[PDB]
Specification:
heterotetramer, A mainly beta, B mainly beta, C little secondary structure, D mainly beta, A: mainly beta, Laminin, two-stranded antiparallel sheet, 33% strand, elongated, B: mainly beta, Thrombin, subunit H, seven-stranded antiparallel β-sheet, 3 helices, 14 strands, globular, binds sodium ion, hydrolase/hydrolase inhibitor, factor Xa, NAPc2, selectide
């Protein structure tokens, strides 16, 4: 995680040697387990 | 905001403006969701009556997207003191939900530990507001934003005459004369991470505005993430 | 806002 | 006993600061046992319309 946010788009935490990506409300984790995909028209933190 | 620049259309969409009984803006806020505005406790004392406007860019001209919202409940942190400005946090519940639009949209709340190690350690955050454009001048008629370096906490303390608690952090420049000012308080400090903006600060106080050797002080949102969640229930 | 010693 | 209490321990850790509670909770300003998040309830004034 201290390396490239562990290629997470948003949040990175570590379980037992596994980097483990995650996301703000209104986003859903991509299949790749890294990217964060907006579920709606006005996802938080994006300019419009 | 002293220095910096006007926000382009859709550039600062999480900015709210708190307006008094004379319908004048005295303070800012950050849109957290359709019902919740993040602001400073001290702003509560700077008006007899207030509502929340979203979408304003030029406050001398309606432009579409703008709305006023009545505040239903004020959640004030009850450890706030006007003596130290410690715990300078409050959350407003609106009567009626915001309609997101261009120029109206929430900032993301970060996860606590992650924000500590990775947002607080970026180089810059962005502060925005309608406040005075000079310490002794007039409020801006336009939303402005300013990119501000995070400032190490020992540098912050060194420069400051007043206490800097763990619930605060400094951002700004040493010689450059650009910073937040009066009317910007309660407003957003946000930090970009991989083109998503998370709210990392509340505009709190400064010893003057943009004085050489002085930095704006902000309430440290990552210190209050549990309290913020609970307030949004 | 403005807090002056 | 009481809500969230079990017969037999952990006070409320507040944000920005510094018959037993169940596996779950923590003691607020009144050892009622209540969640980490619910602690923060001790640190809110609720206010209507408003304000100075
Ligand atoms: Na300065």
């Amino acid at each position: 995680c201290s390396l490239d946010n562990g290629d997470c788009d948003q949040f990175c935490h570590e379980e037992q040697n596994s980097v483990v990506c995650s996301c703000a409300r209104g986003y859903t984790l991509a299949d790749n387990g890294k990217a964060c995909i907006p579920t709606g028209p006005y996802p938080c933190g994006k300019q419009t | 905001i002293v220095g910096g620049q006007e926000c382009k259309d859709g550039e600062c969409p999480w900015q709210a403006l708190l307006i008094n009984e004379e319908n004048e803006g005295f303070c800012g806020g950050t849109i957290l969701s359709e019902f919740y505005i993040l602001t400073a406790a001290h702003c509560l004392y700077q008006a007899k009556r207030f509502k929340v406007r979203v979408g304003d860019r030029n406050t001398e001209q309606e432009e579409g997207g703008e709305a006023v919202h009545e505040v239903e409940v004020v959640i004030k942190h009850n450890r706030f003191t006007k003596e130290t400005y410690d715990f300078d946090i409050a959350v407003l519940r609106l009567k009626t939900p915001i309609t997101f639009r261009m120029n109206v949209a929430p900032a993301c709340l970060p996860e606590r530990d992650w924000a500590e190690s990775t947002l607080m350690t970026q180089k810059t955050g962005i502060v925005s507001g309608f406040g005075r454009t000079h310490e002794k001048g007039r409020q801006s008629t336009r939303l402005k934003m300013l990119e501000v370096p995070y400032v190490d906490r020992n540098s912050c303390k060194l420069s400051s005459s007043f206490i800097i608690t763990q619930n605060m952090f400094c951002a700004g420049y040493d010689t450059k004369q650009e910073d937040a000012c009066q009317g910007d308080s309660g407003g957003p400090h946000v930090t970009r991470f991989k083109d998503t903006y998370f709210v990392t600060g509340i505009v709190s106080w400064g010893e003057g505005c943009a004085r050489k050797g002085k930095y704006g002080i902000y309430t440290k949102v990552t210190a209050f993430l549990k309290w913020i969640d609970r307030s949004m229930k | 806002x403005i807090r002056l010693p | 006993c009481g809500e969230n209490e079990k017969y037999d321990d952990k006070k409320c850790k507040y944000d920005g600061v510094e018959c037993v509670c169940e596996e779950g909770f923590y003691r607020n300003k009144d050892d009622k046992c209540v969640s980490a998040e619910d602690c923060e309830l001790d640190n809110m004034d609720f206010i209507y319309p408003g304000t100075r």
